[PDB]
Amino acid sequence: MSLRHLYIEEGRTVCASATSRNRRPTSESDDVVVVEGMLRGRPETRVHAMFDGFQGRHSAMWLAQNVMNYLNDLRDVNEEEITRQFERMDGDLRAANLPGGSSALIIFVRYEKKPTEARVVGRQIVPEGFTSVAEALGGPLMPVVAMNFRRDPRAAKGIYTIHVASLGNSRCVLKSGRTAIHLSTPHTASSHKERHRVQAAGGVFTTVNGELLLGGVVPMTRAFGSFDFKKGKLQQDLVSAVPDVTTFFAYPGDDIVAGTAGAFAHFRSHAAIAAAIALYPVSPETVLDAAKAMVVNAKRRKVTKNISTFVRHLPESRTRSQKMLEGTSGENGEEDFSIDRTNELTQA
Amino acid sequence: MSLRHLYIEEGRTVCASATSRNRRPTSESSDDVVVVEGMLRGRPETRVHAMFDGFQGRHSAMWLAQNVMNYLNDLRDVNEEEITRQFERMDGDLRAANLPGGSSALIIFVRYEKKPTEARVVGRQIVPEGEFTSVAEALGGPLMPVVAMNFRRDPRAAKGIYTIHVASLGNSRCVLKSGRTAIHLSTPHTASSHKERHRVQAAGGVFTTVNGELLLGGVVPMTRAFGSFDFKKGGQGKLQQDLVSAVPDVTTFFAYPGDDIVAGTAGAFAHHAAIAAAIALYPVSPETVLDAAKAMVVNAKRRKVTKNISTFVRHLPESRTRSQKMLEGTSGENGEEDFSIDRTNELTQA
Amino acid sequence: SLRHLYIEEGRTVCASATSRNRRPTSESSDDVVVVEGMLRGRPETRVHAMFDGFQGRHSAMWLAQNVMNYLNDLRDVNEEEITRQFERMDGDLRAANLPGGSSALIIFVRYEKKPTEARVVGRQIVPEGEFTSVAEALGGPLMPVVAMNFRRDPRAAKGIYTIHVASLGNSRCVLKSGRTAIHLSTPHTASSHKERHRVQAAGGVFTTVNGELLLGGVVPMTRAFGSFDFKKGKLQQDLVSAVPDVTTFFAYPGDDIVAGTAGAFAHFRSHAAIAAAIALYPVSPETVLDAAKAMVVNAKRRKNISTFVRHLPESRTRSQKMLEGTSGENGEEDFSIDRTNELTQA
Amino acid sequence: SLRHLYIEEGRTVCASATSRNRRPTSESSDDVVVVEGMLRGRPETRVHAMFDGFQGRHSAMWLAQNVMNYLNDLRDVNEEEITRQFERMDGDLRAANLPGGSSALIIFVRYEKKPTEARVVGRQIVPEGAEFTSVAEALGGPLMPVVAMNFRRDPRAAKGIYTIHVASLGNSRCVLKSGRTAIHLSTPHTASSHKERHRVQAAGGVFTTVNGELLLGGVVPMTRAFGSFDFKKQGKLQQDLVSAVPDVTTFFAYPGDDIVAGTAGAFAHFRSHAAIAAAIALYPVSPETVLDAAKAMVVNAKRRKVTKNISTFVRHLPESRTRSQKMLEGTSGENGEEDFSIDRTNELTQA
């Protein structure tokens, strides 16, 4: 419910912006969130990442702790470069020798004052000679349209390109108008594709104390830890660390809402998740309230599996204001710096 | 009274330690700010603690606390001249920002010295090389001889010692608590000093009774401080000498593991044997430091004091530590550090 | 030959006192060598390695001065674990973008004061768990795999030296035993049908270029660090592989290990002639330096040369000694159960 | 001059990387020299040492490779602390059972951007706790007064000064160059020293001529050294005839100044100790002609008659720091260049 204490980490953010590199995380001191990070690369991009770790919170903590040092090595923000760093991160994790176990979600957000066409399916961008996230979950198949933003009115004030890198079950939704849409697909034992990929490589699933586990240990078919299920004695990776990259464009006024599996558990239908996200308000001055709400009523339906939420309202223009607040009742981080108003929240 | 809410800032401290430099001021959000602890690039075994009691506004004070570490990094070494060189620099720039002048300052340099060198000493205070008078003598106390100390032949210095440098400029106080003995670390720059009183008046200054209180120029409740430029060697009255000095009083002292540094704004007092007695009798300890600080604020309010209250307390450990911890909470405004050879704590209440 | 030399002496005495050292030797060219490195916690192990740079030595220098941190992270010194680290070094090489790439040869020598039993074919050990011997791979005859018990075998009385060879490229490693010599590694280039079929099968295409068969008409190796332009970095498959060819052999005291860059073994070119020459070169525990240097001068057979020779001692030790000198640049190690030497062409 | 030299560059980068190092030069033959070293926890403070051994290199060689061990034990760099370590060393050396024989000269050089003040006798810094005499007057020079020097209000070196500590024990010499000026930093421990000859002779020891010149007890070439235990407090010598208590002096130098040192052989043939100062005064106030500077001293001492062995050292106190690192051990004869940050030193030996 209502909050009672807060501090102003503000000064910390001011010095960061000025140096061109920063990474603000928020762990509750199993999941760890990096509310917002900045790459030495592009001053126009902001990374937001989530790490839900199984069996420990050690691998997730490691992940969120070194990620910006790896992403800082991308030479361009695209699928293969993203995927390169991922396998590189997994590799070093195995060298960190920690009790394996962690999913991952990295959201890349870039603002383009003057965007130029690209090939699009609905709101998603097709990069190369493809199936939509929408076609994945139900959703009717559909036609790619050559989209020219140059002459698009809604792109009058620029647009926000979004790269979503997901390995696991953390979810990401784009909210726009009175509609909501998934930006990534869960890598669970639910999906028939993943389930089939695993079993077709010689992987066996088994119900263990109430839920499906790969080899009776991994609660995912795709994740960062569990090297006991990656090659090395297996011939193939049963649990993949290959981040499947997704790209979406967004207009000013839309919002990015993301969270760990916990934040989205207990919804009769995956359709009901979008309907519930498309229902909530979440205005610029209520981003945080929104982030916190998500946790609050996520505990009303009952699951205290870990819970982490994140909200970001996309701005019409830049604000030279700056503000970063941390508060408590679960932990809440608010960041209001130059073209983003964001916040995450996590209960115990 | 009792604490209700508190947040754990451990991540922020873990990161700072890794960077080799940090600041962290406790601010009540009225007139004072506290740099509970900060690191200097280079100085690995040194910590810093500062206190700023704002006069007619929190402006100058907040300015000082915001830049204090920016000047301390330009120290080639922690000296009396080197620190006084920085004071001038700060006071100089404070005027550049021309805010409503007004701020007392109490800065504490503490370094861990495993195997310190010999030094001429007047019971705990260290006499500089190359004309000495001690905080003790000054506060009109029995005057002792300077005696050469050999830490090689001293069992109390077996597990190292902490060297303390204090730069006082104002009425803030710093005491050293060693078992059931307690000692002052500086002289409050007030009209109660016959040394300060002489200086101001000789330079032409005029103290005068205003609203029951005696103020320099009937404005400044101190003979030393940052800002208050109408009495500095500033310009309009083309004063030929600082009536109010920005020249800090720097003193050195050594402590043993187990000792506690006790510090607070002039408001934390309204007793000086009393001050000493009280501190010498308080139950400071590793897992009590925070309480120790809170109690000090409580004790004074209880002692019916209306001025600003800010208290700081650090318990000097025997062995260096490995864990880390930082909490910020409310009942008043508290923040505590638990890193390495450091166990810090501070408090403030409007 | 021999005009001036130092005593990095103390330098090697304390690094030895910490269980971790990594002294390299480079020209003052393109290749660089870690004449000897020690990994933390493996007192009876020693690493030697050399890196041949292709198109600018920036990439090889990286590797030689980073290789140890990586090795210090391997759980056990075996095929899987070693390849494990190659995959990683390759990756961190990318993020530190340098042109070209490098060939690599790493040698791990471990002293077994008390051998046991291992399945071998000649001096080569077959890993516990389809073996193709190096000798057979080079043109030598197929030989039965046979169980060997070092337990009471006299040759192994004073103990044995187990050797792991990680090879990526065309650098060569050989074991000299008396007037005989065998190969511990084998290059994997385009001249290899098998290696060639790997590339083509993955969609890579070789094409002759100015008298030279090049992968994609750019790189000359099929395995090396770098050349990411042909790495999986649409390249959905690695064309140039960083995955090393690892092999194990065992040596008895008295025999020597001899390694060198492609330049060192350039114009003999009869897998057999290279071996004969080495078999024929005399090497006492007092001439390793002469050796290493000789190998470089003998290269004055119309040619970038770098050599490494090491004489495995019968005894447990003698003491500290590390000399560096010039005519060509040389580095010389002498501690515990080790007598090392390295040399390079200016 | 130089025919074959060689870059030890990388070693000094790694060494500077970590906090300490010590680079002795030796060979070509009883003396050893620590061209440069860095006590841990002590930036902008470098060391330079020289060990000239009598009939045997073992006593010198133990010192040159064990001194930085003791030096890192100094709780501060001053007389009391420097003298105490000499004690331990001479003590531990006795247990090494080496063929006694070696003089010593140690130079500590610290730079302070902002010097404060000291009581000074024309360049020499008088220590706190005053009957001060020392170098200049002791070498029979014009008496100069003790002044209260305030570096804070001194024009020269508004960019700092270099504090020099010399721990001399034996017949080696160390001089400070400044412009066209030459100045001694130590007094040799020989029979020529009225004080030394006096101390020894009042202690019971006797000088007597053996094969040419006179030696303490008929064996020692100097009155102070590290070995020669037969003359250290079995006769109940309750007084050290051959002391191992060094003569510690302190001086400051302005940037642009140079420090020059050498074994007794380097300065071997001069009609006077003034002749030496004169000569060294001729030498290039080396901006970076340092290496040749040292070299010349070798050749020249070889130009005058060479008797014992010869070793030289030169350091130039730069106006500014530097990021360029370079170390070159080379052989025209044996020599090594040292260039790093505020440092620029040169080593040299032959025999």
PDB file of C-alpha atoms in Angstrom, chain C residues 125-284:
ATOM      1  CA  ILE C 125      47.962 -40.501 -25.013  1.00  0.00           C
ATOM      2  CA  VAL C 126      44.383 -41.366 -26.003  1.00  0.00           C
ATOM      3  CA  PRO C 127      41.838 -39.477 -23.860  1.00  0.00           C
ATOM      4  CA  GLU C 128      39.649 -41.516 -21.502  1.00  0.00           C
ATOM      5  CA  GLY C 129      36.359 -41.805 -23.359  1.00  0.00           C
ATOM      6  CA  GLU C 130      37.690 -42.091 -31.909  1.00  0.00           C
ATOM      7  CA  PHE C 131      41.425 -41.478 -31.866  1.00  0.00           C
ATOM      8  CA  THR C 132      43.424 -40.312 -34.893  1.00  0.00           C
ATOM      9  CA  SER C 133      47.111 -40.043 -34.016  1.00  0.00           C
ATOM     10  CA  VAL C 134      49.123 -36.931 -34.890  1.00  0.00           C
ATOM     11  CA  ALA C 135      51.747 -39.140 -36.514  1.00  0.00           C
ATOM     12  CA  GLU C 136      49.157 -40.824 -38.728  1.00  0.00           C
ATOM     13  CA  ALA C 137      47.655 -37.432 -39.474  1.00  0.00           C
ATOM     14  CA  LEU C 138      51.050 -36.270 -40.696  1.00  0.00           C
ATOM     15  CA  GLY C 139      51.618 -39.248 -43.004  1.00  0.00           C
ATOM     16  CA  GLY C 140      53.011 -41.727 -40.527  1.00  0.00           C
ATOM     17  CA  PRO C 141      51.602 -45.289 -40.130  1.00  0.00           C
ATOM     18  CA  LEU C 142      48.514 -46.356 -38.187  1.00  0.00           C
ATOM     19  CA  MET C 143      49.539 -48.068 -34.986  1.00  0.00           C
ATOM     20  CA  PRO C 144      47.526 -50.094 -32.492  1.00  0.00           C
ATOM     21  CA  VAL C 145      46.357 -48.330 -29.370  1.00  0.00           C
ATOM     22  CA  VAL C 146      47.926 -50.169 -26.446  1.00  0.00           C
ATOM     23  CA  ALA C 147      47.489 -50.037 -22.672  1.00  0.00           C
ATOM     24  CA  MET C 148      50.661 -48.818 -20.943  1.00  0.00           C
ATOM     25  CA  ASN C 149      51.561 -49.189 -17.293  1.00  0.00           C
ATOM     26  CA  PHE C 150      54.259 -46.721 -16.283  1.00  0.00           C
ATOM     27  CA  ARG C 151      54.224 -48.306 -12.826  1.00  0.00           C
ATOM     28  CA  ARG C 152      57.309 -50.502 -13.083  1.00  0.00           C
ATOM     29  CA  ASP C 153      58.618 -49.367 -16.478  1.00  0.00           C
ATOM     30  CA  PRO C 154      62.223 -48.172 -15.855  1.00  0.00           C
ATOM     31  CA  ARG C 155      62.041 -45.364 -18.406  1.00  0.00           C
ATOM     32  CA  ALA C 156      59.454 -43.769 -16.143  1.00  0.00           C
ATOM     33  CA  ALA C 157      61.320 -44.458 -12.894  1.00  0.00           C
ATOM     34  CA  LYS C 158      62.467 -40.867 -12.405  1.00  0.00           C
ATOM     35  CA  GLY C 159      58.977 -39.832 -13.446  1.00  0.00           C
ATOM     36  CA  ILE C 160      57.349 -38.477 -16.581  1.00  0.00           C
ATOM     37  CA  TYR C 161      56.267 -35.175 -18.113  1.00  0.00           C
ATOM     38  CA  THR C 162      52.719 -35.046 -19.386  1.00  0.00           C
ATOM     39  CA  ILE C 163      52.297 -32.612 -22.259  1.00  0.00           C
ATOM     40  CA  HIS C 164      49.228 -30.842 -23.559  1.00  0.00           C
ATOM     41  CA  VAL C 165      49.423 -29.027 -26.855  1.00  0.00           C
ATOM     42  CA  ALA C 166      46.750 -26.508 -27.866  1.00  0.00           C
ATOM     43  CA  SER C 167      47.194 -25.689 -31.536  1.00  0.00           C
ATOM     44  CA  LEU C 168      45.410 -23.133 -33.667  1.00  0.00           C
ATOM     45  CA  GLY C 169      47.183 -22.418 -36.893  1.00  0.00           C
ATOM     46  CA  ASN C 170      50.483 -23.416 -38.464  1.00  0.00           C
ATOM     47  CA  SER C 171      52.931 -22.968 -35.608  1.00  0.00           C
ATOM     48  CA  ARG C 172      54.852 -26.178 -34.909  1.00  0.00           C
ATOM     49  CA  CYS C 173      55.647 -28.224 -31.817  1.00  0.00           C
ATOM     50  CA  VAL C 174      57.989 -31.236 -31.677  1.00  0.00           C
ATOM     51  CA  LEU C 175      59.403 -33.655 -29.119  1.00  0.00           C
ATOM     52  CA  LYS C 176      63.099 -34.496 -29.411  1.00  0.00           C
ATOM     53  CA  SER C 177      64.085 -37.774 -27.762  1.00  0.00           C
ATOM     54  CA  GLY C 178      67.745 -38.557 -28.299  1.00  0.00           C
ATOM     55  CA  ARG C 179      68.356 -38.637 -32.051  1.00  0.00           C
ATOM     56  CA  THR C 180      64.656 -39.201 -32.721  1.00  0.00           C
ATOM     57  CA  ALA C 181      61.898 -36.623 -32.926  1.00  0.00           C
ATOM     58  CA  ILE C 182      58.135 -36.720 -33.227  1.00  0.00           C
ATOM     59  CA  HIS C 183      55.349 -34.224 -33.851  1.00  0.00           C
ATOM     60  CA  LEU C 184      53.165 -33.068 -31.002  1.00  0.00           C
ATOM     61  CA  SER C 185      51.061 -30.796 -33.193  1.00  0.00           C
ATOM     62  CA  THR C 186      50.017 -30.505 -36.807  1.00  0.00           C
ATOM     63  CA  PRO C 187      48.957 -27.438 -38.754  1.00  0.00           C
ATOM     64  CA  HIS C 188      45.435 -27.123 -40.094  1.00  0.00           C
ATOM     65  CA  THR C 189      45.343 -25.056 -43.225  1.00  0.00           C
ATOM     66  CA  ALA C 190      43.705 -25.011 -46.654  1.00  0.00           C
ATOM     67  CA  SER C 191      46.224 -27.554 -47.877  1.00  0.00           C
ATOM     68  CA  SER C 192      44.168 -29.945 -45.777  1.00  0.00           C
ATOM     69  CA  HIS C 193      41.295 -31.559 -47.607  1.00  0.00           C
ATOM     70  CA  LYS C 194      39.478 -32.244 -44.359  1.00  0.00           C
ATOM     71  CA  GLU C 195      40.002 -28.692 -43.094  1.00  0.00           C
ATOM     72  CA  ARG C 196      39.150 -27.436 -46.558  1.00  0.00           C
ATOM     73  CA  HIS C 197      35.949 -29.465 -46.709  1.00  0.00           C
ATOM     74  CA  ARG C 198      34.954 -27.965 -43.389  1.00  0.00           C
ATOM     75  CA  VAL C 199      35.047 -24.467 -44.778  1.00  0.00           C
ATOM     76  CA  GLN C 200      33.384 -25.222 -48.081  1.00  0.00           C
ATOM     77  CA  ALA C 201      30.725 -27.302 -46.368  1.00  0.00           C
ATOM     78  CA  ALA C 202      29.828 -24.308 -44.203  1.00  0.00           C
ATOM     79  CA  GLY C 203      29.550 -22.113 -47.270  1.00  0.00           C
ATOM     80  CA  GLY C 204      33.058 -20.681 -47.213  1.00  0.00           C
ATOM     81  CA  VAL C 205      34.898 -20.317 -50.492  1.00  0.00           C
ATOM     82  CA  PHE C 206      38.616 -20.505 -51.160  1.00  0.00           C
ATOM     83  CA  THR C 207      40.078 -18.654 -54.123  1.00  0.00           C
ATOM     84  CA  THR C 208      43.645 -18.332 -55.365  1.00  0.00           C
ATOM     85  CA  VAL C 209      44.969 -14.794 -54.956  1.00  0.00           C
ATOM     86  CA  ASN C 210      48.289 -13.609 -56.351  1.00  0.00           C
ATOM     87  CA  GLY C 211      49.711 -17.125 -56.133  1.00  0.00           C
ATOM     88  CA  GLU C 212      48.025 -17.780 -52.816  1.00  0.00           C
ATOM     89  CA  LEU C 213      44.949 -19.818 -51.878  1.00  0.00           C
ATOM     90  CA  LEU C 214      42.901 -17.533 -49.565  1.00  0.00           C
ATOM     91  CA  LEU C 215      39.688 -18.085 -47.675  1.00  0.00           C
ATOM     92  CA  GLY C 216      37.226 -15.642 -49.227  1.00  0.00           C
ATOM     93  CA  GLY C 217      40.289 -14.273 -50.956  1.00  0.00           C
ATOM     94  CA  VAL C 218      41.296 -12.545 -47.722  1.00  0.00           C
ATOM     95  CA  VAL C 219      42.734 -14.730 -44.945  1.00  0.00           C
ATOM     96  CA  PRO C 220      45.312 -17.486 -45.326  1.00  0.00           C
ATOM     97  CA  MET C 221      44.474 -19.494 -42.186  1.00  0.00           C
ATOM     98  CA  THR C 222      41.360 -21.562 -41.583  1.00  0.00           C
ATOM     99  CA  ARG C 223      41.952 -21.506 -37.876  1.00  0.00           C
ATOM    100  CA  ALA C 224      43.239 -18.568 -35.896  1.00  0.00           C
ATOM    101  CA  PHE C 225      42.183 -15.826 -33.518  1.00  0.00           C
ATOM    102  CA  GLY C 226      40.674 -12.790 -35.207  1.00  0.00           C
ATOM    103  CA  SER C 227      39.669 -12.388 -38.843  1.00  0.00           C
ATOM    104  CA  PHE C 228      36.210 -11.864 -37.408  1.00  0.00           C
ATOM    105  CA  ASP C 229      35.227 -10.706 -40.873  1.00  0.00           C
ATOM    106  CA  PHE C 230      35.102 -14.472 -41.532  1.00  0.00           C
ATOM    107  CA  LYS C 231      34.119 -15.405 -38.003  1.00  0.00           C
ATOM    108  CA  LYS C 232      30.473 -16.067 -37.255  1.00  0.00           C
ATOM    109  CA  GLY C 233      30.377 -12.345 -36.509  1.00  0.00           C
ATOM    110  CA  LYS C 234      25.192 -13.040 -42.638  1.00  0.00           C
ATOM    111  CA  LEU C 235      27.676 -15.457 -41.199  1.00  0.00           C
ATOM    112  CA  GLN C 236      25.561 -17.901 -39.276  1.00  0.00           C
ATOM    113  CA  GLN C 237      28.642 -20.186 -39.104  1.00  0.00           C
ATOM    114  CA  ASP C 238      32.337 -19.806 -38.189  1.00  0.00           C
ATOM    115  CA  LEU C 239      34.403 -20.117 -41.338  1.00  0.00           C
ATOM    116  CA  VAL C 240      37.784 -19.411 -39.731  1.00  0.00           C
ATOM    117  CA  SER C 241      37.758 -21.346 -36.477  1.00  0.00           C
ATOM    118  CA  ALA C 242      39.250 -20.393 -33.134  1.00  0.00           C
ATOM    119  CA  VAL C 243      38.575 -23.920 -31.781  1.00  0.00           C
ATOM    120  CA  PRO C 244      42.039 -25.476 -31.181  1.00  0.00           C
ATOM    121  CA  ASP C 245      43.358 -28.902 -31.989  1.00  0.00           C
ATOM    122  CA  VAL C 246      44.359 -30.292 -28.596  1.00  0.00           C
ATOM    123  CA  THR C 247      46.573 -33.315 -27.961  1.00  0.00           C
ATOM    124  CA  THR C 248      48.360 -35.044 -25.109  1.00  0.00           C
ATOM    125  CA  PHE C 249      51.713 -36.845 -25.075  1.00  0.00           C
ATOM    126  CA  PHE C 250      54.067 -37.999 -22.350  1.00  0.00           C
ATOM    127  CA  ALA C 251      57.818 -37.443 -22.235  1.00  0.00           C
ATOM    128  CA  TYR C 252      60.644 -38.960 -20.147  1.00  0.00           C
ATOM    129  CA  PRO C 253      63.427 -36.850 -18.592  1.00  0.00           C
ATOM    130  CA  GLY C 254      66.206 -36.254 -21.083  1.00  0.00           C
ATOM    131  CA  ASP C 255      64.086 -35.482 -24.135  1.00  0.00           C
ATOM    132  CA  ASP C 256      63.446 -31.940 -25.372  1.00  0.00           C
ATOM    133  CA  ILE C 257      60.451 -29.982 -26.586  1.00  0.00           C
ATOM    134  CA  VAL C 258      61.081 -27.821 -29.640  1.00  0.00           C
ATOM    135  CA  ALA C 259      58.652 -25.240 -30.937  1.00  0.00           C
ATOM    136  CA  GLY C 260      58.649 -22.480 -33.492  1.00  0.00           C
ATOM    137  CA  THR C 261      56.543 -20.266 -35.725  1.00  0.00           C
ATOM    138  CA  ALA C 262      55.872 -21.271 -39.329  1.00  0.00           C
ATOM    139  CA  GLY C 263      58.905 -19.211 -40.261  1.00  0.00           C
ATOM    140  CA  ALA C 264      61.176 -21.489 -38.241  1.00  0.00           C
ATOM    141  CA  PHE C 265      60.091 -24.560 -40.216  1.00  0.00           C
ATOM    142  CA  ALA C 266      59.581 -22.868 -43.565  1.00  0.00           C
ATOM    143  CA  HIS C 267      61.793 -24.251 -46.319  1.00  0.00           C
ATOM    144  CA  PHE C 268      62.523 -27.879 -45.234  1.00  0.00           C
ATOM    145  CA  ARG C 269      58.965 -28.888 -46.052  1.00  0.00           C
ATOM    146  CA  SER C 270      59.044 -32.662 -45.864  1.00  0.00           C
ATOM    147  CA  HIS C 271      57.234 -33.335 -42.614  1.00  0.00           C
ATOM    148  CA  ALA C 272      60.158 -35.731 -42.429  1.00  0.00           C
ATOM    149  CA  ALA C 273      62.997 -33.298 -43.134  1.00  0.00           C
ATOM    150  CA  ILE C 274      61.892 -30.972 -40.371  1.00  0.00           C
ATOM    151  CA  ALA C 275      61.941 -33.894 -37.954  1.00  0.00           C
ATOM    152  CA  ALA C 276      65.285 -35.263 -39.124  1.00  0.00           C
ATOM    153  CA  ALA C 277      67.024 -31.915 -38.722  1.00  0.00           C
ATOM    154  CA  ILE C 278      65.743 -31.621 -35.169  1.00  0.00           C
ATOM    155  CA  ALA C 279      66.515 -35.256 -34.405  1.00  0.00           C
ATOM    156  CA  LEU C 280      70.010 -34.418 -35.549  1.00  0.00           C
ATOM    157  CA  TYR C 281      70.457 -31.219 -33.583  1.00  0.00           C
ATOM    158  CA  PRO C 282      72.412 -31.760 -30.357  1.00  0.00           C
ATOM    159  CA  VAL C 283      70.847 -30.344 -27.202  1.00  0.00           C
ATOM    160  CA  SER C 284      72.293 -30.719 -23.729  1.00  0.00           C
TER     161      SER C 284
END
